[PDB]
């Protein structure tokens, strides 16, 4: 299981958000902590991504692009898994110090997006997703959203995506296998609409931000203003397995 060996070896460890759980919840404090967490996890997503089998085959502009287009989906999927494994989807386990109960879901003003993420989390149990299936699906997710006009070196991306699909089929193979690939790819497809809803909410927040006054950091202001609108405007779109 060379491939699975590597995926387990590069998998990032726990990441905390830095949230003050001793203060009462507010919209501003929750979103500041999600921004901080989002930025800390992005660092781990880059380290992880650069270590993936064949990732260096990609043109370096495409390496950078692909991480920024898929990072929200990656985080959503990974958070859903943590939620499932740590608290049986009872709450959303963003980080060990940032666990969302329904009240925080409501307070964050992202209730509809949280309910969908909690549903994603429950499917990990309904489908009895293995940790090894989890690792392969998450890797495939990195290669599942691209510009409609193509990447700098599209052929190398194509063959890379192909190999990750082949390895996912492998640990399903290792009929039954038929129904399973179907179910897992439906689950993967469902990640993308949730990431877009998070993007739309947060884009709107950045723009109005002057009014709802919330300090957008660093890398976040850049990614939401430079890359995220490509996705919201349809210039960058998910690669779906199934027709939506």
């Amino acid at each position: 299981p060379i491939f699975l060996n590597v995926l387990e070896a590069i998998e990032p460890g726990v990441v905390c958000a830095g949230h003050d759980n001793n203060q009462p919840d507010s919209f501003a404090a929750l979103l500041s902590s999600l921004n901080e967490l989002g930025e800390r996890q992005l660092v781990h997503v880059v380290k992880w991504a650069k270590a993936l089998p064949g990732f260096r085959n990609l043109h370096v502009d495409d390496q950078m692009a692909v991480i920024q287009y898929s990072w929200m989906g990656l985080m959503v999927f990974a958070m859903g898994w943590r939620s499932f494994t740590n608290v049986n989807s009872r709450m959303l386990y963003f980080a060990p110090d940032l666990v969302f109960n329904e009240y925080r879901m409501h307070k964050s003003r992202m209730y509809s997006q949280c309910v969908r993420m909690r549903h994603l989390s429950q499917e990990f149990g309904w489908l009895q997703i293995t940790p090894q299936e989890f690792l392969c699906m998450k890797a495939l997710l990195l290669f599942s959203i691209i510009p409609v006009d193509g990447l700098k070196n599209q052929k190398f991306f194509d063959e890379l995506r192909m190999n990750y699909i082949k390895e996912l089929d492998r640990i399903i193979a290792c009929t039954s296998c038929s129904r399973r690939f179907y179910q897992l790819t439906k689950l993967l497809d469902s990640v993308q609409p949730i990431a877009r809803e998070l993007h739309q909410f947060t884009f709107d927040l950045l723009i109005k931000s002057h009014m709802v006054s919330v300090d957008f950091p660093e890398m976040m202001a850049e990614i939401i203003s430079v890359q995220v609108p490509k996705i919201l405007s349809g210039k960058v779109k998910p690669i779906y397995f199934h027709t939506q």
């Binding site: 992005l42 660092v43 880059v46 650069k50 390496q63 950078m64 920024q68 890398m219 850049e222």
Partner: peptide, 11 residues
């Protein structure tokens, strides 16, 4: 850009 700085910062 900030993202490129990060990306390049990673070994």
């Amino acid at each position: 850009g900030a993202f490129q700085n990060l990306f390049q910062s990673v070994r």
